[PDB]
Homo-oligomer: A and B are copies of this chain.
Amino acid sequence: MITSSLPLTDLHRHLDGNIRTQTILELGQKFGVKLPANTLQTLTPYVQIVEAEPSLVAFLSKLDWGVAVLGDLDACRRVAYENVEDALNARIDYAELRFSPYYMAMKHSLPVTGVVEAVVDGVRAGVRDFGIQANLIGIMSRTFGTDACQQELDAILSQKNHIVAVDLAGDELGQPGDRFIQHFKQVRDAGLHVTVHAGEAAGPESMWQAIRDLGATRIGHGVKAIHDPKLMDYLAQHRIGIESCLTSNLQTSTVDSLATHPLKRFLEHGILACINTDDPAVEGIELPYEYEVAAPQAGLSQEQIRQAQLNGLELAFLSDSEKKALLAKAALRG
C-alpha cells in the first residue's frame, strides 16, 4: 500500500513506452499509419504485453507501435503532456519521465532536437495544468548503435537546462555499456546525473561497468546483483540506487516469479531500492498496483514497502532542499 504521508515518486518511467492506446489509434489515423487493428480492444494485444516475453528484446518490440504514430513534433508534445496527466492519475507526487528522442523520431524521420524541445514543452504544459512535480531524463537507445546515441546525446544536451540526467536503455546484451564510455563522459562534463539500465538481461559485470566507468549513481533494474555478494555490499555502502520494476522484470522473463524477485533481499541488505512502473501502458499496470499487488506478491512487508517509497524520494535527482520540501508537503496528509 501507498503511504499517504510520504511523497510518491516514479523514477523509472518511460514516457515513450506509455502511450495511450486511444492516442495510438487517433495519431495512427491522423498520419495514415496502417495499424494491426482499429479498435481499443482489438489493438490492445499488439501494443500491450499479453504474457511474459522470452527476453528483453522481445519485450522491447511492444513499444514499437506507439512511436510508429509520432508523425510530427506536435504528436511528441501531445504524448508528453498526456504522460503528465497519467502520472497525476497514478497518485505520483514527483515523476522522472525518461524518453529516447531518437527512438521517437525514427519512424517518421523527425528532427531529434525538435523532438527534445517538443517533449520539454509538453511536460512543462502538463506540469502547469496538472500540478505535479516532474523532471526529464534523456535516454540514449543503445540498440541503434553508438553513432545514433551520439546524435541523440547532442539533442539531449541542447536542452540540458531542462533535463536532469541521461540514461542508457534498450538491448543490453547486444550493446554493452563499455561502448558508451565517451558518451557518458560528455554527460558528466555537462553536469548531468547518470542512471543506466544494467544487470537486467546481462549480468553483474554490466552493473560494475556502469558504476565504475559510466559513473552511474542509479541503476535501472540491477536484478543480477543478487548473484554477486560483493556487488550487493558495494551498492549498500556507496548508496547506489536500484530502480526496481517488478512487473517489468516478470514480463521480460528477467525474473521467473515475483516470489523470487530480489527486491526484498536488496532492502534487507540496506540497499536503496525503490519501486517504479517502467513502461506502464505496454505492461498494463500503473504505480498503485505495483504497490498494492506486485510488491506484496514479491514478499515485501508493509514496512519494507514504506522503506522503498522513502528510498524513491532519497534517490530522486533533486536537491536536498527540494527533497526536504516534498517530505514536508506530504507529511501534512494522511
Residues of A participating in the B interface, judged by any CB pair closer than 8 Å: 20, 36-39, 41-42, 44-46, 48-52, 86, 89-90, 247, 250-251, 280-281, 283-286, 288-289, 292-294
Contacts and interface: CB of A to CB of B under 8 A. Distances in A.
A41 B281 contact: yes
Nearest to A54: B257
Contacts of A49: 51
B280 A41 contact: yes
A44 B286 contact: yes
B247 A51 contact: yes
Contact of A44 (B36, B251, B285): B285
A50 B284 contact: yes
Contact of A286 (B42, B285, B288): B42
B41 A86 contact: yes
B51 A286 contact: no
Which secondary structure dominates chain A's binding surface?
A: helix
A166 to B, nearest CB: 27
Contacts of A89: 38-39, 41-42
B45 A285 contact: yes
Nearest to A289: B45
Q: 5 smallest A-B Cβ distances: which pairs? A: A45-B289, A45-B285, A42-B286, A39-B89, A51-B250
A37 B86 contact: no
A36 B247 contact: no
9 contacts: A36-B292, A42-B286, A42-B289, A44-B284, A45-B284, A45-B289, A46-B289, A50-B284, A50-B294
A49 B52 CA distance: 11
A90 B37 CA distance: 9
B50 A283 contact: yes
A281 B50 CA distance: 11
A293 to B, nearest CB: 7
Contacts of A288: 36-37, 42
A247 B42 CA distance: 14
Given A41-B280, A44-B285, A45-B286, 15 more contacts: A36-B292, A37-B288, A39-B89, A41-B86, A41-B286, A42-B289, A45-B285, A45-B293, A46-B293, A50-B294, A51-B52, A51-B247, A51-B250, A51-B251, A284-B284
A285 B292 CA distance: 25
A57 to B, nearest CB: 16
Nearest to A89: B39
A64 to B, nearest CB: 14
A120 to B, nearest CB: 23
A86 B40 CA distance: 10
Given A41-B86, A42-B90, A48 B289 contact: no
A36 B20 CA distance: 20
A36 B50 CA distance: 21
Nearest to A287: B42
A215 to B, nearest CB: 34
A263 to B, nearest CB: 16
A283 B50 CA distance: 7
